Amino acid sequence: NIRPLHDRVIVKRKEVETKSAGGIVLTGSAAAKSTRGEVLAVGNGRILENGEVKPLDVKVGDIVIFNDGYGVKSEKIDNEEVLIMSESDILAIVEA
Amino acid sequence: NIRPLHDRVIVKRKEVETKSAGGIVLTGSAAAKSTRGEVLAVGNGRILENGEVKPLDVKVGDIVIFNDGYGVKSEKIDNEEVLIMSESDILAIVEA
Amino acid sequence: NIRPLHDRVIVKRKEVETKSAGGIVLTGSAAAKSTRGEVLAVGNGRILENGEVKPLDVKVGDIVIFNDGYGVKSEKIDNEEVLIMSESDILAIVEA
Amino acid sequence: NIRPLHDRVIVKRKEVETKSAGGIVLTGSAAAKSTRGEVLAVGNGRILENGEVKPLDVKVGDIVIFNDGYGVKSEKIDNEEVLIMSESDILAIVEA
Amino acid sequence: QDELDVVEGMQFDRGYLSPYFINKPETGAVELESPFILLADKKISNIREMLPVLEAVAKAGKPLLIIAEDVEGEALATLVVNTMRGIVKVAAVKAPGFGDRRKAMLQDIATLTGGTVISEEIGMELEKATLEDLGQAKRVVINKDTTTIIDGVGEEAAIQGRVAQIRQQIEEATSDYDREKLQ
């Protein structure tokens, strides 16, 4: 098990889209890495300057749209790829 | 449904202007991407350093003028293009 | 003995993986430096702007996944290599 | 006598290691500048935004491991070399 | 005296990419018995792309021969170490021919050995290659200059069809050097 620290979140990246809306298969650069992923683990929460801890708005097991960048790190757990990134990198959460 | 986090806002970009004031059709670089868009979804609000949450001044369904940049991300929902950007990127709101 | 200051942490880097999942031996750039390490020493805690001291969430003797960068420094104690890095550089802690 | 200001610390750099573990003599770039040094003088303490003064965790006469950089300045007192650097530049303190 | 040297089956003038691959030091030639055949149409420099194929080959236990555009750097090094460690008896050779003609020989070897060529244009990558993707042959002999594949395990009908296609191209060919190359 992996427990992220502070506001960091462990997210498993969704599979790359291999097909278009009408059935066109995308390959190479056409099938870019997905920016959405389900949340695998949520940290305790971001620590504020007053010493308190605020729980993250992301829960465990929800699909979130995040932003890839220098703040996102790649890791291998149970020989599967996961991403560790701050809660600020997550733009939104997919509902329904 | 997409729920933005903190001060992020989901906005659908308005259509590019294909005509001028007097009927001149603009094509290519002349018809640049519109900086105005209707708000599709509003986040809970920006989190301050004291732990409180302040609701965003942008509401759902109003036309806002925003600034394109690195802080604005592009996403595809219901195979239509939307933009996720912080409330600071929105310069103003179009009224009437 | 080495006592880190404020939020700094002394961590011994784990050994480089010399084998793959099914027995393939990795050499050179294939066997990159491990981003996980056991915590050797924990500082007193990060000092906040109000003067208080908040103990670090990392304990002594746990495996943590951290990020290599300019904020991480290399040192030699008991002619063995250790890394001094801030608690923010540690993405997560490996449990079980 | 030299009295550092705020969180600055006056440290005398330790001598460069001229020998290896088993007796191999290092010369030139092999014998790099030591990152450890004994503390010669401790400032009053870092001033916080509220006006208070917090005493530094480094004491006078202890061996500390610090980081060389732009924040560290070189000075000559009693025609001997010393370094003035902020308490943040000191990674750790060597004990026993 | 006039000598006659006859080489049967497939043999292309491409030696091993490393002298350390030699299984038989007394002859200086890699000898692989019933090995898998990995045909890559792209230059290989890292082991990440080829890793799952190596895991599958090691699980199978049969040797491997990689006909590639070029193997060098880290990938060659780790193949060498794995060859001595005995986990996988693997040899790597350069793909014969040059642009617009090397692909033809690669497809010929794939048809002979019943395998598939890995390339960006065909659609799949080296990471997703499986055992069924790899070709099969009864024997493989690599020397310093030439590599010979003896009794490739491929469908006879496919081989005859590819031969007929090459004959059709020969009939369409308008150059003596080119027609001799396809011959």
Side-chain angles (χ1 to χ4, degrees), chain A residues 1-15 17-32 34-96, chain B residues 1-15 17-32 34-96, chain C residues 1-15 17-32 34-96, chain D residues 1-15 17-32 34-96, chain E residues 1-7 9-183:
Chain A
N1 193 40
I2 302 301
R3 189 172 112 275
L5 263 201
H6 311 297
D7 58 337
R8 306 257 163 76
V9 180
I10 301 290
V11 161
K12 187 201 298 301
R13 184 165 272 163
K14 291 225 94 48
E15 72 313 357
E17 39 271 31
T18 168
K19 206 168 303 314
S20 192
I24 302 303
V25 168
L26 295 316
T27 43
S29 170
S34 182
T35 53
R36 306 159 181 249
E38 97 264 29
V39 166
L40 286 197
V42 175
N44 50 284
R46 181 215 320 174
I47 271 75
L48 315 98
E49 90 296 330
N50 46 19
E52 286 87 288
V53 175
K54 193 177 186 307
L56 307 185
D57 302 354
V58 316
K59 316 310 199 184
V60 182
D62 49 13
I63 325 295
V64 296
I65 315 175
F66 56 91
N67 179 33
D68 222 323
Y70 32 96
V72 193
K73 268 266 308 203
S74 269
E75 210 56 40
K76 288 290 312 315
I77 70 90
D78 89 5
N79 63 354
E80 201 266 325
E81 172 95 343
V82 290
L83 306 112
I84 327 168
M85 83 216 105
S86 295
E87 207 216 359
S88 54
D89 295 355
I90 291 179
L91 298 306
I93 307 148
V94 187
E95 287 179 354
Chain B
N1 193 40
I2 302 301
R3 189 172 112 275
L5 263 202
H6 311 297
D7 58 337
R8 306 257 163 76
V9 180
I10 301 290
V11 161
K12 187 201 298 301
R13 184 165 272 163
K14 291 225 94 48
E15 72 313 357
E17 39 271 31
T18 168
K19 206 168 303 314
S20 192
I24 302 303
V25 168
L26 295 317
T27 43
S29 170
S34 182
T35 53
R36 306 159 181 249
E38 97 264 29
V39 166
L40 286 197
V42 175
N44 50 284
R46 181 215 321 174
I47 271 75
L48 315 98
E49 90 296 330
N50 46 19
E52 286 87 288
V53 175
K54 193 177 186 306
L56 307 185
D57 302 354
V58 316
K59 316 310 199 184
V60 182
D62 49 13
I63 325 295
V64 296
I65 315 175
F66 56 91
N67 179 33
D68 222 323
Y70 32 96
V72 192
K73 268 266 308 203
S74 269
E75 210 56 40
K76 288 290 312 315
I77 70 90
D78 89 5
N79 63 354
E80 201 266 325
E81 172 95 343
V82 290
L83 306 112
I84 327 168
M85 83 216 105
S86 295
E87 207 216 359
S88 54
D89 295 355
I90 291 179
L91 298 306
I93 307 148
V94 187
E95 286 179 354
Chain C
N1 194 40
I2 302 301
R3 189 172 112 275
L5 263 201
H6 311 297
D7 58 337
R8 306 257 163 76
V9 180
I10 301 290
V11 161
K12 187 201 298 301
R13 184 165 272 163
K14 291 225 94 48
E15 72 313 358
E17 39 271 31
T18 168
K19 206 168 303 314
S20 192
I24 302 303
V25 168
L26 295 316
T27 43
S29 170
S34 182
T35 53
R36 306 159 181 249
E38 97 264 29
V39 166
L40 286 197
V42 175
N44 50 284
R46 181 215 320 174
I47 271 75
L48 315 99
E49 90 296 330
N50 46 19
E52 286 87 288
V53 175
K54 193 177 186 306
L56 307 185
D57 302 354
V58 316
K59 316 310 199 184
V60 182
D62 49 13
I63 325 295
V64 296
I65 315 175
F66 56 91
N67 179 33
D68 222 323
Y70 32 96
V72 192
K73 268 266 308 203
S74 269
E75 210 56 40
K76 288 290 312 315
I77 70 90
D78 89 5
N79 63 354
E80 201 266 325
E81 172 95 343
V82 290
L83 306 112
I84 327 168
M85 83 216 105
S86 295
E87 207 216 359
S88 54
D89 295 355
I90 291 179
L91 298 306
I93 306 148
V94 187
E95 287 179 354
Chain D
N1 193 40
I2 302 301
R3 189 172 112 275
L5 263 202
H6 311 297
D7 58 337
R8 306 257 163 76
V9 180
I10 301 290
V11 161
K12 187 201 298 301
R13 184 165 272 163
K14 291 225 94 48
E15 72 313 358
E17 39 271 31
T18 168
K19 206 168 303 314
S20 192
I24 302 303
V25 168
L26 295 316
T27 43
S29 170
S34 182
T35 53
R36 306 159 181 249
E38 97 264 29
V39 166
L40 286 197
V42 175
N44 50 284
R46 181 215 321 174
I47 271 75
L48 315 99
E49 90 296 330
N50 46 19
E52 286 87 288
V53 175
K54 193 177 186 306
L56 307 185
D57 302 354
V58 316
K59 316 310 199 183
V60 182
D62 49 13
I63 325 295
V64 296
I65 315 175
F66 56 91
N67 179 33
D68 222 323
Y70 32 96
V72 192
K73 268 266 308 203
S74 269
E75 210 56 40
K76 288 290 312 315
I77 70 90
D78 89 5
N79 63 354
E80 201 266 325
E81 172 95 343
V82 290
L83 306 112
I84 327 168
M85 83 216 105
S86 295
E87 207 216 359
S88 54
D89 295 356
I90 291 179
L91 298 306
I93 306 148
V94 187
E95 287 179 354
Chain E
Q1 308 303 120
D2 284 18
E3 303 309 281
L4 173 60
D5 305 302
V6 175
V7 165
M10 171 100 48
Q11 165 166 326
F12 45 93
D13 43 7
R14 289 293 196 190
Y16 41 67
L17 280 153
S18 171
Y20 301 101
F21 284 143
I22 287 157
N23 291 7
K24 192 141 49 180
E26 60 254 22
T27 66
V30 202
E31 205 134 336
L32 309 173
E33 259 78 23
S34 75
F36 287 101
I37 297 294
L38 165 59
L39 306 135
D41 205 13
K42 62 171 299 294
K43 173 164 337 184
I44 298 168
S45 40
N46 255 300
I47 213 54
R48 163 222 77 261
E49 53 269 58
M50 200 180 358
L51 243 179
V53 197
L54 296 172
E55 327 254 0
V57 161
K59 190 184 307 300
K62 286 155 61 70
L64 178 69
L65 163 72
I66 304 148
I67 300 101
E69 202 138 45
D70 198 10
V71 182
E72 80 277 0
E74 305 292 334
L76 215 164
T78 169
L79 282 180
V80 166
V81 202
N82 279 271
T83 322
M84 285 129 256
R85 298 287 175 78
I87 303 137
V88 50
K89 311 182 303 303
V90 57
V93 298
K94 204 174 299 309
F98 282 75
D100 294 359
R101 201 178 300 272
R102 174 215 317 280
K103 327 165 104 54
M105 275 144 233
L106 266 170
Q107 191 32 244
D108 295 358
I109 302 159
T111 301
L112 168 92
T113 48
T116 317
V117 190
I118 317 292
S119 185
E120 271 63 45
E121 320 168 359
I122 171 66
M124 71 294 216
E125 305 286 59
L126 194 42
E127 287 86 355
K128 305 168 184 54
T130 57
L131 279 195
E132 198 79 19
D133 198 313
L134 302 190
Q136 200 128 31
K138 283 198 197 57
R139 290 258 281 96
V140 159
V141 170
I142 304 115
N143 89 11
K144 184 261 145 203
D145 184 37
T146 70
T147 279
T148 320
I149 296 177
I150 319 162
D151 300 348
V153 189
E155 288 299 319
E156 216 73 51
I159 290 165
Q160 303 293 6
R162 158 140 301 250
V163 152
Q165 144 183 0
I166 291 151
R167 286 196 199 123
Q168 293 341 282
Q169 309 174 211
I170 282 164
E171 299 171 8
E172 294 150 17
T174 59
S175 167
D176 289 348
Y177 165 75
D178 300 348
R179 89 157 40 78
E180 195 28 50
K181 265 305 206 331
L182 304 70
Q183 249 306 306

